[PDB]
């Protein structure tokens, strides 16, 4: 089904297997950059995260988690997400394709 299942079929050759290991490498560097903006921004959710009930904090509070909310969901930051499943699952499908040839070839 997704696009580099067709492109990346059975290594036949090692020059195939370099191009795999090349195409690894450089998608791998952008996974890792992409995950730590996303953990990052999870991270600034859990410094705020870091008493009785009142009205006015009741009500900041509220104001507090709708901000989060919105940042939360957001359509940029859910792309961003995305892209490293996306990523995530491009990379396994190449390095298991050099793992089985690997295997193979001793």
Do not use: G, W
């Amino acid at each position: 089904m997704p696009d580099y299942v067709a492109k990346y079929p059975v290594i036949q050759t090692d020059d195939e297997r370099e191009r795999y290991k090349a195409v690894f490498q450089d998608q791998f560097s952008e996974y890792k950059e992409l995950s730590a903006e996303v953990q990052a921004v999870l991270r600034k959710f859990d410094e705020l995260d870091a008493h009785s009930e009142s009205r006015q904090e009741h009500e900041r509070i509220s104001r507090i988690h709708e901000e989060f909310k919105k940042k939360k969901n957001d359509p940029t930051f859910l792309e961003k997400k995305e892209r490293c499943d996306y990523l995530k699952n491009k990379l396994s499908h190449i390095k298991q394709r050099i793992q089985e040839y690997d295997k193979v070839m001793n």
